[PDB]
Amino acid sequence: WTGIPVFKLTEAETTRLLRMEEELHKRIIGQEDAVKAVSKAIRRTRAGLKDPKRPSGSFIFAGPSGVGKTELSKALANFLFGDDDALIQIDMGEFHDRFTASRLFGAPPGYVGYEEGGQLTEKVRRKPFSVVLFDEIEKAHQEIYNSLLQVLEDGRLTDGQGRTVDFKNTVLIFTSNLGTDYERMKQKVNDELKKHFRPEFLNRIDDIIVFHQLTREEIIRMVDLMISRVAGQLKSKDMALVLTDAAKALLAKRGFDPVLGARPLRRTIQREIEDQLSEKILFEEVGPGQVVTVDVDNWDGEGPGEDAVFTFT
Amino acid sequence: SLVLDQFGRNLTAAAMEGKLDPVIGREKEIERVMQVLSRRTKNNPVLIGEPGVGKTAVVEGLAQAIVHGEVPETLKDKQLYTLDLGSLVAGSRYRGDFEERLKKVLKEINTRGDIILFIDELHTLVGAGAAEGAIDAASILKPKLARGELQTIGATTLDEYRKYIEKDAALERRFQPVQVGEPTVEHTIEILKGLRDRYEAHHRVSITDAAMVAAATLADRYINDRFLPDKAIDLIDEAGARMRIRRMVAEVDDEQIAEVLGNWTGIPVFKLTEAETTRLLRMEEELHKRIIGQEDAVKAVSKAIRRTRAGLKDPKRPSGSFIFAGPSGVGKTELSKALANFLFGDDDALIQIDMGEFHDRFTASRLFGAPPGYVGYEEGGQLTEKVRRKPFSVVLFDEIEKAHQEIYNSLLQVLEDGRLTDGQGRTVDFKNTVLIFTSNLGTERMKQKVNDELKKHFRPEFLNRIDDIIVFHQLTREEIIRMVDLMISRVAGQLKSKDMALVLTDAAKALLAKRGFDPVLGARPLRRTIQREIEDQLSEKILFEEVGPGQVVTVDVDNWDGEGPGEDAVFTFT
Amino acid sequence: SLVLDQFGRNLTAAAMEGKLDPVIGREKEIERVMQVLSRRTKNNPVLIGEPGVGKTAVVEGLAQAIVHGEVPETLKDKQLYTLDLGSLVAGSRYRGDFEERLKKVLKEINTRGDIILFIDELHTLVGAGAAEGAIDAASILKPKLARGELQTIGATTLDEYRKYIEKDAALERRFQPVQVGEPTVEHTIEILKGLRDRYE
Ligand SMILES: Nc1ncnc2c1ncn2[C@@H]1O[C@H](COP(=O)(O)OP(=O)(O)O)[C@@H](O)[C@H]1O
Ligand SMILES: Nc1ncnc2c1ncn2[C@@H]1O[C@H](COP(=O)(O)OP(=O)(O)O)[C@@H](O)[C@H]1O
Ligand SMILES: Nc1ncnc2c1ncn2[C@@H]1O[C@H](COP(=O)(O)OP(=O)(O)O)[C@@H](O)[C@H]1O
Ligand SMILES: Nc1ncnc2c1ncn2[C@@H]1O[C@H](COP(=O)(O)OP(=O)(O)O)[C@@H](O)[C@H]1O
């Protein structure tokens, strides 16, 4: 009827639930605390022991930019529903104005736009078991926080139409950028949140998670896990990509920067490999039924490699 | 049967002759609706779903299941009828005719007892003979639907279920919701495999596996205002139509549906022809015809769009996002204009929005429209509808420093995921757009100064979202000489419209170059010089009848050695 | 035909006497709309365009193509009728006259099979007479356009398209958007050269 997975725990889904930390780790590298907390939340939800009034899960994500705060939520949505589109993505960046709070729950009666009701309220009513993402929560005003102040404790919200929607089976995730060796920046993030967010609001969130900074082993795994996307895109045109170990080492070497996130790795691969592949494809260097072997020339594998180049077969 | 035919259509009798489309992949939905239909009391399901997911296909699938005999004992030999409420209300000069027709219909289907009734586009029950609070069809059906002696199924959409059914809770009480999910890409693949035969027979053509595979792929990837499998079915139907037109056995392949998608949504996702291939590999010189210098930016944008055209561009990020930083006048807007001319042939196809007007915090609602309950809700956003007219377009943000941080906060989602939710609540696609941001900031050393100024005046996540950071360098003497070349070229092009021919000597051009070199150059200076010392004299001479039409004008120089400052030099117009 | 003349005007009969101005340079739009009319299911295009570009001129060019007979076999010997929604909804004085008239018109189209409809000001299809006990024409024509036994074309300004047609996703579903863009400079010159004879 309503899609809420209050079922008998079969063996397959049980074995999936015990091992879902690895399943989230298939896409999310690092951030073991956040993945563990999400696993505990979903285990508490599916075991039937939960506070009826409170939602299934409420968390706030903070840390550097591009550390998978949104990606963990997207992977969780893919885990629960089978696709990334099912995630309710409400972006708080266009809610800088105070008067824009009506976009969430709807228009009051007597005004224009009363008939279609709210936006997130309707989407919650359609899919009661869904994860709702609020990106850039620091960037909207604190006035809009008050509508969610009810659902982070009671899980009920009243639209402009007047009907009450429920948030008891929804997972709420908030992502911010406050603060931006681990515990000092964790305390800095805590102080930033305490000064910027009212303490009465912060107590209604089940857990606060500080995202850890990306390290070298994380980015060397990241190169493979993200070039898998390029390989899969190439497979749509009967193209095969393989990277040498030196290719991975050079890609991680030129994209390592602790002050930014993983988007530098995207920049590195985009400016080094993908553009060259596009040039060779449109110049017909490689054709259908052919594989591509990318190797690093003029490098030892240990130096910084300011002169290393990529060879294509 | 003698009464139902006058006001309805037998779907089972249609299934006798096989006029219905075969339905595949909806076994779960069929089992759910039959599970509702097997109830004792209040056994009436409703097909709730998005427009274009196969809600009707559910009921023809049910009819096919009945006529094949897959049904259990409770649904055997049940004639299935869709009901035209328009046929009920038509021809009723008095109320007695209308609800007499309705009571005769319900009495007949109760007496026979083997008719399942279908209501298509269900919301019309609230108000049939009169208003909601008077006698209508729904009020008559309340005792029959409540006690559950009548089996009725219906289909409605989410917005309609919210705008017609839900405001009267009595209607939604008697209907169990059964959601018809939008099929996945492989699900639409099997659906296309199933419906291959009818379209191949009608259009007298042949369709290959790669054809509808690529059709489903591009349909899910690119079009963001329609829903599967409907748009892919539309593409297959019109593609068979195009081949049938072109013949007066043909084969339907991926290049045809690619050309169709280009015709429909304007996306140039085509099988690359040789001429446009050589154009794309050599478009750097084509850009260098208009914008001269700044090789790094031209090469970067060339690489980005070469990625876009080769199908190697990431679906969830846009085609390309760039910050154009440098001193004023170098040609940052000229580069975007040149890309617009290359992509579309015209400069008006470039959607240009200035950030100077967004100098206040209250101006943030202009891009994506007004919140509900306020003025300006009906027309919606400004940039969102402009993107909606043309999915493949380049957007320009002139003088990005004048904008304040709330604009970048509202645009971070466009930079990263490439979606934008308007005030209406609809998501607007940006996966086929090119992002251009022009900055005049920081004025080898200029690179560091510009980067420091950008990281000072922008948040770290915004500079993380942007793809490539480009610092425009100051022009050179050869570059301003080629500026003079372009200037005299466009001046002569304007002059040819009035039966006049224009030419300049090398010495005059060198004098123009000598009077047009400073670090405050670009094009805003040395165009003042042209308009003052060449255009002014030409207009002056042509208004009092010298150098008129039919005579070629040559611009020379006098009292100059060709090397000095040329302050005493005077332009001569022969 | 004995019922349709009281509610519509035959553009094919207008094309018999050449009462429509010649159309120049709209080959791409006319071939696209002719392609959409060749479909089996949901063969109903809409000419979305800025007002004053010649959305009605595209339909007149279709009529000229029909009378000159260069259309493929799927449009041979078919009359193009425009539909006057006002005349349909004008004389009712009751509740059931409008639906009876619309059903009679659709029955005539079904029993003839050589009529293509054109609806000026398409957005009036939704709420084409909305009383307390009235059912609009849009819901009546939804099943007819869904399967495709009814073939119609429409012209709509993008603004009013977004105001009314987009608000009802069901009517958006049955309709194929065909964009009629602004003519270029040389296109305007060619159109003026075409119209020069009639204007002199
Ligand atoms: N652990 C991870 N696994 C996979 N991708 C990651 C991970 N961390 C970061 N990314 C990359 O970061 C990008 C998303 O960053 P995001 O978390 O949205 O930053 P922010 O939360 O500041 O907006 C994605 O493109 C993704 O490739
Ligand atoms: N599984 C399927 N098999 C065959 N055709 C399908 C299937 N799913 C959808 N379709 C086609 O897509 C269209 C969906 O129409 P639908 O959305 O049910 O109309 P409505 O919105 O009025 O219920 C139908 O015309 C049908 O031909
Ligand atoms: N190198 C150039 N080639 C051709 N035209 C140019 C060049 N530089 C500037 N222009 C002209 O001068 C104008 C200046 O544009 P731009 O440098 O972007 O201004 P700003 O720096 O204030 O954004 C452009 O619109 C263009 O028409
Ligand atoms: N190719 C063409 N040849 C001749 N006239 C044209 C052409 N294109 C447009 N027109 C002119 O456009 C006008 C039709 O505009 P129309 O579509 O009726 O606008 P609206 O839909 O706003 O009423 C006619 O008067 C016609 O003369």
GROMACS .gro file of N, CA, C and O in nm, chain A residues 1 65 89 91 93-94 96 99-100 102-103 107 111-112 115-116 119 122 125-126 136 139 163 177 226 229 233-234 237 260-261 263-264 266-267 270-271 274-275 277-279 281-282, chain B residues 32 50 158 162-163 166-167 177 179 277 281 303 306-307 310-314 317 368 371-374 377 406 409-410 412-413 416-417 419 421-422 424-425 461 464-468:
model
  352
    1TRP      N    1   0.083  -0.120   0.000
    1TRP     CA    2   0.000   0.000   0.000
    1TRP      C    3   0.086   0.126   0.000
    1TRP      O    4   0.080   0.207  -0.093
   65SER      N    5   3.462   2.093   0.178
   65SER     CA    6   3.377   2.074   0.061
   65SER      C    7   3.425   1.954  -0.019
   65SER      O    8   3.545   1.926  -0.025
   89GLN      N    9   1.563   1.581  -0.293
   89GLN     CA   10   1.669   1.680  -0.284
   89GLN      C   11   1.606   1.818  -0.280
   89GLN      O   12   1.564   1.871  -0.384
   91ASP      N   13   1.704   2.192  -0.206
   91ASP     CA   14   1.826   2.272  -0.200
   91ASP      C   15   1.796   2.403  -0.129
   91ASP      O   16   1.711   2.481  -0.174
   93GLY      N   17   1.988   2.662  -0.095
   93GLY     CA   18   2.060   2.777  -0.147
   93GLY      C   19   1.973   2.885  -0.207
   93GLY      O   20   2.015   3.001  -0.211
   94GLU      N   21   1.854   2.850  -0.254
   94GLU     CA   22   1.759   2.948  -0.306
   94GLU      C   23   1.660   2.995  -0.201
   94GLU      O   24   1.559   3.056  -0.236
   96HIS      N   25   1.752   3.204   0.058
   96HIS     CA   26   1.817   3.312   0.131
   96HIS      C   27   1.715   3.413   0.182
   96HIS      O   28   1.728   3.466   0.293
   99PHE      N   29   1.099   3.541   0.280
   99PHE     CA   30   0.966   3.515   0.227
   99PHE      C   31   0.959   3.386   0.146
   99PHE      O   32   0.850   3.347   0.103
  100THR      N   33   1.072   3.319   0.124
  100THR     CA   34   1.075   3.199   0.043
  100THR      C   35   1.041   3.073   0.121
  100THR      O   36   1.043   2.964   0.063
  102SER      N   37   0.761   2.972   0.216
  102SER     CA   38   0.635   2.913   0.171
  102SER      C   39   0.657   2.810   0.061
  102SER      O   40   0.564   2.735   0.027
  103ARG      N   41   0.777   2.806   0.003
  103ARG     CA   42   0.805   2.707  -0.101
  103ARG      C   43   0.809   2.565  -0.046
  103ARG      O   44   0.798   2.469  -0.123
  107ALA      N   45   0.132   2.758   0.002
  107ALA     CA   46   0.078   2.892   0.015
  107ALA      C   47  -0.041   2.894   0.111
  107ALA      O   48  -0.118   2.797   0.117
  111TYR      N   49  -0.456   3.338  -0.108
  111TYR     CA   50  -0.348   3.388  -0.192
  111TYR      C   51  -0.335   3.301  -0.315
  111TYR      O   52  -0.395   3.193  -0.325
  112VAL      N   53  -0.256   3.348  -0.411
  112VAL     CA   54  -0.230   3.271  -0.532
  112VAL      C   55  -0.138   3.155  -0.498
  112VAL      O   56  -0.053   3.164  -0.409
  115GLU      N   57  -0.372   2.621  -0.435
  115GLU     CA   58  -0.432   2.495  -0.477
  115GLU      C   59  -0.329   2.382  -0.490
  115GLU      O   60  -0.361   2.267  -0.460
  116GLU      N   61  -0.207   2.413  -0.533
  116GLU     CA   62  -0.111   2.305  -0.558
  116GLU      C   63  -0.043   2.259  -0.429
  116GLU      O   64   0.023   2.155  -0.428
  119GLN      N   65   0.560   2.164  -0.174
  119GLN     CA   66   0.651   2.088  -0.259
  119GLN      C   67   0.709   1.966  -0.189
  119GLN      O   68   0.693   1.854  -0.238
  122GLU      N   69   0.414   1.729  -0.054
  122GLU     CA   70   0.357   1.639  -0.153
  122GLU      C   71   0.449   1.522  -0.183
  122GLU      O   72   0.404   1.407  -0.189
  125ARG      N   73   0.435   1.280   0.097
  125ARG     CA   74   0.310   1.206   0.092
  125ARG      C   75   0.312   1.099  -0.016
  125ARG      O   76   0.253   0.991   0.002
  126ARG      N   77   0.377   1.126  -0.129
  126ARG     CA   78   0.386   1.025  -0.234
  126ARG      C   79   0.470   0.906  -0.190
  126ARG      O   80   0.430   0.790  -0.209
  136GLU      N   81   2.340   2.279   0.181
  136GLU     CA   82   2.381   2.416   0.214
  136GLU      C   83   2.286   2.479   0.316
  136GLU      O   84   2.229   2.586   0.296
  139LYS      N   85   2.331   2.838   0.450
  139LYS     CA   86   2.319   2.949   0.357
  139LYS      C   87   2.180   3.010   0.354
  139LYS      O   88   2.166   3.128   0.318
  163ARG      N   89  -0.377   2.010   0.584
  163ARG     CA   90  -0.355   1.871   0.619
  163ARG      C   91  -0.217   1.853   0.681
  163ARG      O   92  -0.126   1.933   0.659
  177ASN      N   93   2.894   2.369   0.566
  177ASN     CA   94   3.037   2.387   0.540
  177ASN      C   95   3.105   2.466   0.652
  177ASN      O   96   3.203   2.536   0.625
  226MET      N   97   3.622   0.641  -0.949
  226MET     CA   98   3.562   0.744  -1.031
  226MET      C   99   3.593   0.727  -1.179
  226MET      O  100   3.508   0.759  -1.263
  229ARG      N  101   3.340   0.535  -1.380
  229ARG     CA  102   3.235   0.606  -1.453
  229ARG      C  103   3.275   0.633  -1.597
  229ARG      O  104   3.195   0.614  -1.689
  233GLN      N  105   3.102   0.484  -1.931
  233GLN     CA  106   3.057   0.571  -2.039
  233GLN      C  107   3.120   0.529  -2.172
  233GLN      O  108   3.055   0.535  -2.277
  234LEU      N  109   3.247   0.487  -2.168
  234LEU     CA  110   3.314   0.440  -2.289
  234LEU      C  111   3.254   0.309  -2.339
  234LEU      O  112   3.251   0.286  -2.460
  237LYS      N  113   3.001   0.309  -2.618
  237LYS     CA  114   3.047   0.323  -2.755
  237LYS      C  115   3.148   0.215  -2.793
  237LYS      O  116   3.232   0.237  -2.880
  260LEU      N  117   4.135   2.130  -0.045
  260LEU     CA  118   4.011   2.106  -0.118
  260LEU      C  119   3.972   1.959  -0.108
  260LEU      O  120   4.038   1.882  -0.037
  261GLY      N  121   3.866   1.920  -0.178
  261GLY     CA  122   3.817   1.784  -0.168
  261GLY      C  123   3.856   1.695  -0.284
  261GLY      O  124   3.974   1.687  -0.319
  263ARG      N  125   3.689   1.705  -0.600
  263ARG     CA  126   3.673   1.778  -0.726
  263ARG      C  127   3.806   1.815  -0.791
  263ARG      O  128   3.811   1.825  -0.915
  264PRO      N  129   3.915   1.841  -0.716
  264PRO     CA  130   4.046   1.847  -0.783
  264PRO      C  131   4.084   1.720  -0.858
  264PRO      O  132   4.148   1.729  -0.963
  266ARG      N  133   3.868   1.521  -1.007
  266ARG     CA  134   3.788   1.534  -1.128
  266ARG      C  135   3.852   1.631  -1.226
  266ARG      O  136   3.856   1.604  -1.346
  267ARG      N  137   3.903   1.743  -1.175
  267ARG     CA  138   3.972   1.840  -1.260
  267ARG      C  139   4.095   1.777  -1.325
  267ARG      O  140   4.119   1.796  -1.445
  270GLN      N  141   3.988   1.518  -1.586
  270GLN     CA  142   3.923   1.587  -1.696
  270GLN      C  143   4.024   1.658  -1.786
  270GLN      O  144   4.011   1.656  -1.909
  271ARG      N  145   4.126   1.721  -1.727
  271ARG     CA  146   4.225   1.792  -1.806
  271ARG      C  147   4.336   1.701  -1.859
  271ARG      O  148   4.408   1.742  -1.950
  274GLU      N  149   4.049   1.259  -2.021
  274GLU     CA  150   3.924   1.262  -2.095
  274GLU      C  151   3.933   1.349  -2.219
  274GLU      O  152   3.881   1.313  -2.325
  275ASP      N  153   3.998   1.465  -2.208
  275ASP     CA  154   4.014   1.553  -2.324
  275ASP      C  155   4.099   1.487  -2.432
  275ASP      O  156   4.068   1.497  -2.552
  277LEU      N  157   4.133   1.163  -2.478
  277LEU     CA  158   4.051   1.057  -2.537
  277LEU      C  159   3.950   1.114  -2.635
  277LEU      O  160   3.926   1.055  -2.741
  278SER      N  161   3.890   1.228  -2.603
  278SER     CA  162   3.796   1.292  -2.695
  278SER      C  163   3.866   1.335  -2.823
  278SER      O  164   3.812   1.315  -2.933
  279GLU      N  165   3.986   1.392  -2.811
  279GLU     CA  166   4.062   1.432  -2.929
  279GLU      C  167   4.097   1.312  -3.016
  279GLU      O  168   4.083   1.318  -3.139
  281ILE      N  169   3.941   1.021  -3.026
  281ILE     CA  170   3.820   0.962  -3.082
  281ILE      C  171   3.772   1.042  -3.202
  281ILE      O  172   3.741   0.986  -3.307
  282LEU      N  173   3.767   1.175  -3.189
  282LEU     CA  174   3.720   1.256  -3.300
  282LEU      C  175   3.823   1.267  -3.412
  282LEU      O  176   3.787   1.299  -3.525
  345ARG      N  177  -0.166  -0.652  -0.807
  345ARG     CA  178  -0.215  -0.562  -0.703
  345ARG      C  179  -0.359  -0.518  -0.728
  345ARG      O  180  -0.442  -0.519  -0.637
  363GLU      N  181   0.204   0.904  -1.246
  363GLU     CA  182   0.247   1.017  -1.325
  363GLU      C  183   0.190   1.006  -1.466
  363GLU      O  184   0.176   0.895  -1.519
  471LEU      N  185  -0.119   1.250  -1.008
  471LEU     CA  186  -0.088   1.295  -0.873
  471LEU      C  187  -0.141   1.435  -0.847
  471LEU      O  188  -0.200   1.462  -0.741
  475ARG      N  189  -0.465   1.544  -0.629
  475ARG     CA  190  -0.456   1.646  -0.525
  475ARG      C  191  -0.553   1.758  -0.556
  475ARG      O  192  -0.586   1.832  -0.466
  476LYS      N  193  -0.598   1.771  -0.680
  476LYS     CA  194  -0.679   1.893  -0.708
  476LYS      C  195  -0.822   1.859  -0.735
  476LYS      O  196  -0.894   1.942  -0.788
  479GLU      N  197  -0.875   1.473  -0.356
  479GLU     CA  198  -0.834   1.479  -0.216
  479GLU      C  199  -0.912   1.583  -0.135
  479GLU      O  200  -0.934   1.563  -0.015
  480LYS      N  201  -0.958   1.691  -0.199
  480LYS     CA  202  -1.036   1.792  -0.127
  480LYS      C  203  -1.171   1.739  -0.080
  480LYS      O  204  -1.231   1.798   0.011
  490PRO      N  205  -0.538   0.345  -0.299
  490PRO     CA  206  -0.432   0.389  -0.390
  490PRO      C  207  -0.344   0.273  -0.435
  490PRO      O  208  -0.300   0.191  -0.354
  492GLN      N  209  -0.011   0.273  -0.673
  492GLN     CA  210   0.082   0.357  -0.747
  492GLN      C  211   0.136   0.281  -0.868
  492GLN      O  212   0.177   0.165  -0.855
  590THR      N  213   3.302   1.731  -3.822
  590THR     CA  214   3.418   1.677  -3.751
  590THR      C  215   3.541   1.763  -3.775
  590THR      O  216   3.610   1.803  -3.681
  594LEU      N  217   3.747   1.983  -3.495
  594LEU     CA  218   3.891   1.971  -3.469
  594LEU      C  219   3.965   2.100  -3.500
  594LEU      O  220   4.069   2.128  -3.440
  616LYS      N  221   3.836   2.217  -2.584
  616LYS     CA  222   3.842   2.084  -2.524
  616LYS      C  223   3.711   2.047  -2.456
  616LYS      O  224   3.665   1.933  -2.468
  619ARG      N  225   3.455   1.977  -2.724
  619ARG     CA  226   3.494   1.855  -2.792
  619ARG      C  227   3.458   1.733  -2.709
  619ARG      O  228   3.414   1.630  -2.762
  620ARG      N  229   3.476   1.744  -2.577
  620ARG     CA  230   3.423   1.645  -2.484
  620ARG      C  231   3.272   1.632  -2.495
  620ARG      O  232   3.219   1.520  -2.497
  623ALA      N  233   3.165   1.454  -2.829
  623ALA     CA  234   3.211   1.316  -2.844
  623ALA      C  235   3.141   1.220  -2.751
  623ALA      O  236   3.173   1.100  -2.751
  624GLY      N  237   3.046   1.267  -2.671
  624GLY     CA  238   2.978   1.182  -2.576
  624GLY      C  239   3.067   1.132  -2.465
  624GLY      O  240   3.057   1.015  -2.425
  625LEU      N  241   3.156   1.217  -2.414
  625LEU     CA  242   3.244   1.183  -2.303
  625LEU      C  243   3.224   1.278  -2.186
  625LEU      O  244   3.305   1.283  -2.093
  626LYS      N  245   3.115   1.354  -2.189
  626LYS     CA  246   3.084   1.453  -2.087
  626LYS      C  247   2.993   1.389  -1.983
  626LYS      O  248   2.898   1.317  -2.018
  627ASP      N  249   3.022   1.414  -1.856
  627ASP     CA  250   2.950   1.352  -1.746
  627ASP      C  251   2.804   1.396  -1.743
  627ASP      O  252   2.777   1.517  -1.752
  630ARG      N  253   2.707   1.653  -1.434
  630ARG     CA  254   2.760   1.788  -1.442
  630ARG      C  255   2.728   1.850  -1.578
  630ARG      O  256   2.709   1.779  -1.677
  681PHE      N  257   1.480   3.252  -1.030
  681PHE     CA  258   1.396   3.133  -1.018
  681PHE      C  259   1.253   3.164  -0.977
  681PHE      O  260   1.179   3.072  -0.940
  684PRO      N  261   0.819   3.310  -0.442
  684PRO     CA  262   0.760   3.207  -0.356
  684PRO      C  263   0.609   3.210  -0.365
  684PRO      O  264   0.551   3.309  -0.410
  685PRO      N  265   0.542   3.101  -0.326
  685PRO     CA  266   0.395   3.099  -0.331
  685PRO      C  267   0.331   3.204  -0.243
  685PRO      O  268   0.383   3.242  -0.138
  686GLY      N  269   0.215   3.253  -0.289
  686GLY     CA  270   0.139   3.353  -0.217
  686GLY      C  271   0.180   3.496  -0.243
  686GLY      O  272   0.113   3.588  -0.194
  687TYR      N  273   0.286   3.519  -0.319
  687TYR     CA  274   0.336   3.653  -0.346
  687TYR      C  275   0.313   3.689  -0.492
  687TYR      O  276   0.272   3.605  -0.574
  690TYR      N  277   0.415   3.506  -0.912
  690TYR     CA  278   0.417   3.360  -0.916
  690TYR      C  279   0.377   3.306  -1.053
  690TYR      O  280   0.428   3.202  -1.096
  719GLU      N  281   2.469   3.554  -0.216
  719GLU     CA  282   2.347   3.474  -0.219
  719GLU      C  283   2.319   3.419  -0.358
  719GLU      O  284   2.262   3.310  -0.371
  722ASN      N  285   2.532   3.118  -0.383
  722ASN     CA  286   2.471   3.014  -0.300
  722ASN      C  287   2.353   2.949  -0.371
  722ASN      O  288   2.337   2.826  -0.364
  723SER      N  289   2.271   3.028  -0.440
  723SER     CA  290   2.158   2.971  -0.513
  723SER      C  291   2.202   2.899  -0.639
  723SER      O  292   2.128   2.817  -0.693
  725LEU      N  293   2.509   2.726  -0.668
  725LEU     CA  294   2.602   2.616  -0.641
  725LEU      C  295   2.547   2.482  -0.689
  725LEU      O  296   2.622   2.397  -0.739
  726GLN      N  297   2.417   2.462  -0.672
  726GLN     CA  298   2.353   2.340  -0.719
  726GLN      C  299   2.358   2.329  -0.871
  726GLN      O  300   2.375   2.219  -0.925
  729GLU      N  301   2.711   2.223  -0.956
  729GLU     CA  302   2.748   2.085  -0.925
  729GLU      C  303   2.658   1.983  -0.995
  729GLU      O  304   2.705   1.908  -1.081
  730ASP      N  305   2.530   1.979  -0.960
  730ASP     CA  306   2.441   1.876  -1.010
  730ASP      C  307   2.368   1.922  -1.136
  730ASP      O  308   2.326   1.839  -1.217
  732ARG      N  309   2.083   2.116  -1.162
  732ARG     CA  310   1.939   2.129  -1.153
  732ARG      C  311   1.907   2.262  -1.088
  732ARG      O  312   1.991   2.322  -1.021
  734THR      N  313   1.550   2.445  -0.903
  734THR     CA  314   1.409   2.443  -0.867
  734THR      C  315   1.356   2.585  -0.868
  734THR      O  316   1.408   2.672  -0.798
  735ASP      N  317   1.252   2.609  -0.948
  735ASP     CA  318   1.195   2.742  -0.958
  735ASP      C  319   1.099   2.768  -0.843
  735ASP      O  320   1.076   2.683  -0.757
  737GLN      N  321   0.786   2.791  -0.885
  737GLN     CA  322   0.674   2.701  -0.910
  737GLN      C  323   0.696   2.564  -0.847
  737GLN      O  324   0.598   2.494  -0.818
  738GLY      N  325   0.821   2.526  -0.821
  738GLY     CA  326   0.853   2.397  -0.765
  738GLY      C  327   0.905   2.296  -0.864
  738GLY      O  328   0.933   2.182  -0.825
  774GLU      N  329   3.384   2.662  -0.155
  774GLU     CA  330   3.308   2.561  -0.227
  774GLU      C  331   3.268   2.610  -0.366
  774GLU      O  332   3.255   2.530  -0.459
  777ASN      N  333   3.556   2.560  -0.572
  777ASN     CA  334   3.570   2.416  -0.591
  777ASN      C  335   3.476   2.365  -0.699
  777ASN      O  336   3.509   2.272  -0.772
  778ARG      N  337   3.356   2.425  -0.709
  778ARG     CA  338   3.259   2.380  -0.808
  778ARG      C  339   3.302   2.412  -0.950
  778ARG      O  340   3.273   2.334  -1.042
  779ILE      N  341   3.369   2.525  -0.971
  779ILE     CA  342   3.403   2.570  -1.106
  779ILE      C  343   3.504   2.474  -1.167
  779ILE      O  344   3.588   2.416  -1.097
  780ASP      N  345   3.493   2.453  -1.298
  780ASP     CA  346   3.577   2.353  -1.364
  780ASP      C  347   3.717   2.408  -1.391
  780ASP      O  348   3.817   2.351  -1.345
  781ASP      N  349   3.727   2.518  -1.465
  781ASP     CA  350   3.855   2.573  -1.505
  781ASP      C  351   3.861   2.721  -1.469
  781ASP      O  352   3.764   2.794  -1.491
   0.00000   0.00000   0.00000
